[PDB]
Amino acid sequence: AGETCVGGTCNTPGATCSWPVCTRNGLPV
C-alpha cells in the first residue's frame, strides 16, 4: 500500500524494502 522505506525500515512486519517504498511477496505494501 502506502508503506514507504525512506528511513530504511517499514511499519508493516515482514515487509521488504524497495526504497523509497516497501513491498511484500512482490507486491507493494
Q: How many helices, marked H, and strands, marked E, lie in the chain?
A: 0, 3
Residue 2's φ and ψ, nearest 5 degrees, are -95, 25
C-alpha cell read off for 11: 511499519
Question: Is the bond preceding 20 in cis, omega lying within 30 degrees of 0?
Answer: yes
For 13, 15, 21, the CA distances from 18, given in Å and listed in that order, are: 14, 9, 5
Looking at the DSSP bridge assignments, the partners of residue 27 are 24
Looking at the DSSP bridge assignments, the partners of residue 10 are none
DSSP code at position 24: E
Residue 15's φ and ψ, nearest 5 degrees, are -100, 140
Looking at the DSSP bridge assignments, the partners of residue 4 are 21
Segments making up each domain of the chain, as ranges = 1-29
Q: What DSSP element (H or E) covers 28?
A: strand 27-28
Residue 10: exposed, middle, or buried by beta-carbon count in 10 A (0-12, 13-18, 19+)? buried
